[PDB]
């Protein structure tokens, strides 16, 4: 009973050493995965950021070339909306899209009255009231506002 038990401790020391070597492999394997993930993560971070730079330039281009900038976009169940600031250094408004059809909508949440009359002198009455036209007419709209500004 005394010898048997102590001779088995050898058996236990072996089992430990194998179970232990099998862990040293699972460990090396995770370290590799981590390193892989790190590379990938960094390259994904540059592509997503550097890409922001591109988009800015383009936004910036359109602004210099069309004197019009698109601020944002939402989608309230039915229809997406984009704020817009058009003019030369200006009339803010929004456009909604719901066959296809469009919705104009002057946006003057904030505007020093002096401007609001400067604008009323340059802009045809109707551009101060919500409207609705087919998409085909959009570009034509755009032109009308540019010509008046």
């Amino acid at each position: 009973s005394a010898d048997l038990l102590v001779a088995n401790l050898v058996n236990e020391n072996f089992v430990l050493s194998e179970k232990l070597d099998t862990k040293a492999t699972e460990i090396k394997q995770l370290q590799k995965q981590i390193d892989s993930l790190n590379a990938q993560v960094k390259e994904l971070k540059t592509q997503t950021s550097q890409q922001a730079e591109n988009s800015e330039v383009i936004k910036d281009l359109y602004e210099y070339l069309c004197n019009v900038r698109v601020h944002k976009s939402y989608e309230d169940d039915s229809g997406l909306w984009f704020d817009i600031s058009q003019g030369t250094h200006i009339m803010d408004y929004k456009l909604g899209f719901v066959v296809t059809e469009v919705i104009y909508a002057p946006v003057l949440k904030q505007r020093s009255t002096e401007e609001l009359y400067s604008l009323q002198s340059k802009l045809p009455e109707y551009l101060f009231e919500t409207l609705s036209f087919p998409l085909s007419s959009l570009n034509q709209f755009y032109n009308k506002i540019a010509k008046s500004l």
Copy 2:
């Protein structure tokens, strides 16, 4: 120097001592493993979240690109930066490129075009829009308008 007793040495003493050391060396690895497994999971979330945000922002940019096309009849295909100056291909149908070095450079792009069009276009477009040009940025919008009016 340990020594057992039946009822009722160096090597035997190394067995127990050695059995302990193995049990600790093995448990301390089981913690380094859990810590690594956690780190891996955390890193995975990062990759997945970055993939959605990029696929989502791309979506926005596509919408806007599509908007501008419907509103300005003009689309900006790409952008390069060859040491000095960046370039954008444009399709407004007349394709051309614009270079920025402030000052600008126009450049008709007809790498491929069925001749029938190339004369359709020559009838609508003032001679000079078929030759490279150069103007200040302030004049750009004015340029754009001239091309739209003719097309």
